[PDB]
């Protein structure tokens, strides 16, 4: 039985696409899906030259990931899936970037206690967040970016997807990913003549 | 309908060697057509080994052979050259060239192409067709899978039989999906070859 371990920050549009893909895969393949939290804010800590404006666009970027960690600590890893879905629908599908509102709405949607929102503005969960992030994102390259998935235990950057594959198409892309994971002496495949629009 | 692999190679390149031998393994277990095209490590180095400082020789001979006898001769000429360089570790390139032309059944006079710029434009045109990228510059190996250009699969060993076939099926799946861009291992990197 194949296993997808996926690290996400609700803010990340790449994570959003790749996680929606994995959920499509799960509809047409027998796989175990484990979500884990990582943090774009932590990625950004490790970059001394980040421009002021980009820092400003991330002013309160710890809130959603703190709440996700706190939810997992309180209720188990199982609640990450639906909490992430509720948050990401609002952030990515509705374009809502008032994160305080996204957090309270998403907890209610997911059926989780409202008090979890208080995690967003406390450092109590940061040690756990850092450890979760490092487990997922530690890589040997200076690329260090999202999306990162482990396929049957094999850590990858990508698949970098700019649209969510659906149904059996999603399944076939999973099958291909598993085949590459199964061959230890494969390292990289990348399109050269086109790139994702951002 | 028929799956097609276009493969850009410099006889000197170990990564081209591995990925091209993989494609020839694929051809034994999947119905595919394989087309070889020349590129040049020396050109990559312009736009940026013991025995190999004269790095234009093998690629110049390859291009000259294609110009005179057609691109189909590149498969056996490359096999001849790379068998010697990579499988036998022969780095005397003048000897590799002579021997490989004889292996492939091509005229010995083609060896003279190694030390003439007569087809360097043809070489450059072939190179850029294979190596051009919209993003950051890429290295070897580059291929087209059913018309879709990829860097990689970067492979450090040659998959054989159905294992090779499954890796092709995977590549074809990724090529077929327009909105897939990259998959890369994060905890191991290719060996220093
Ligand atoms: Mg976890
Ligand atoms: Mg500003
Ligand atoms: Mg504290
Ligand atoms: Mg050609």
Query: B189 to chain A: nearest residue by CA?
Result: A187
- The highest-level CATH class for domain A1-198 is alpha beta
Distance A119 CA to ligand 3 centre (A): 11
Per the CB < 8 A criterion, the answer to whether B150 and A191 are in contact is yes
Distance A93 CA to ligand 2 centre (A): 25
Extract the tokens encoding B140.
Answer: 């070897």
Q: How far apart are CA A104 and CA A92, in angstroms?
A: 16
Handedness of CA B25, B29, B30, B35 (dihedral sign): positive
Sequential DSSP letters for B154-191: EESS---HHHHHHHHHHHHHHHH-TTEEEEEESS----
Helix (DSSP H) and strand (DSSP E) numbers for chain A: 8, 5
Method: X-ray
Q: How far apart are CA B155 and CA B190, in angstroms?
A: 8
Give me the residues paired with residue B158 across strands: none
**Angle in degrees, 0-180, between the axes of helices A63-75 and A126-137, rounded to the nearest 10:** 100
First-residue to last-residue Cα distance in chain B? 36
Handedness of CA B155, B159, B163, B164 (dihedral sign): positive
Resolution (A): 1.7
CB crowding A178-195: b at 16 or more within 10 Å, else e: bbbbbbebbbbbbbbeeb
Q: How far apart are CA A126 and CA A130, in angstroms?
A: 6
User: Which residues in chain A have Cβ-Cβ distances shorter than 8 Å to B177?
Assistant: 165, 169, 173
Sequential DSSP letters for chain B: --EEEEEEE-TT-HHHHHHHHHHHHHHHHS-EEEEEEE--HHHHHHT--TT-S-TTHHHHHHHHHHHHH-GGGHHHHHHHHHIIIIIS----HHHHHHHHHHHHT--GGGGGGGG--TTHHHHHHHHHHHH--SSS---S-EEEETTEEEEEEEESS---HHHHHHHHHHHHHHHH-TTEEEEEESS------
Give the minimum alpha-carbon distance from A177 to chain B in angstroms, rounded to a whole number: 7
User: Which residues in chain B have Cβ-Cβ distances shorter than 8 Å to A138?
Assistant: 187
Q: What is the CATH number of domain B1-193?
A: 3.40.30.10
Instruction: State the burial class of residue A53 (Cβ atoms within 10 Å of its Cβ: 0-12, 13-18, 19+).
Output: exposed
Distance B120 CA to ligand 4 centre (A): 14
């Amino acid at each position: 039985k194949s296993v997808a371990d996926f690290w996400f920050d609700p803010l990340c549009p790449w994570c959003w696409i790749t996680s929606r893909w994995i959920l499509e895969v799960a509809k047409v393949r027998d796989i175990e899906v484990n979500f884990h939290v990582m943090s774009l804010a932590i990625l950004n800590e490790n970059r001394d030259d980040l421009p002021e404006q980009y820092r400003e666009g991330m002013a309160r970027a710890w809130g959603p990931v703190r709440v996700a960690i706190a939810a997992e600590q309180a209720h188990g890893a199982k609640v990450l899936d639906p909490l992430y879905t509720a948050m990401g629908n609002r952030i990515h599908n509705q374009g809502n970037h008032e994160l305080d509102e996204v957090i309270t709405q998403s907890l209610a949607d997911a059926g989780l206690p409202a008090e979890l929102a208080k995690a967003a503005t406390s450092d109590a969960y940061d040690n756990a967040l850092r450890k979760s992030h490092h487990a997922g994102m530690d890589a040997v390259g200076e690329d260090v970016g999202t999306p990162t998935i482990h396929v049957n235990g094999v850590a990858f950057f990508g698949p970098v997807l700019s649209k969510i594959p659906r149904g059996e198409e999603a399944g076939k892309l999973w099958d291909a990913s598993v085949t590459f994971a199964s061959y230890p002496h494969f390292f990289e495949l990348k399109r050269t003549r086109t790139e994702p629009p951002q």
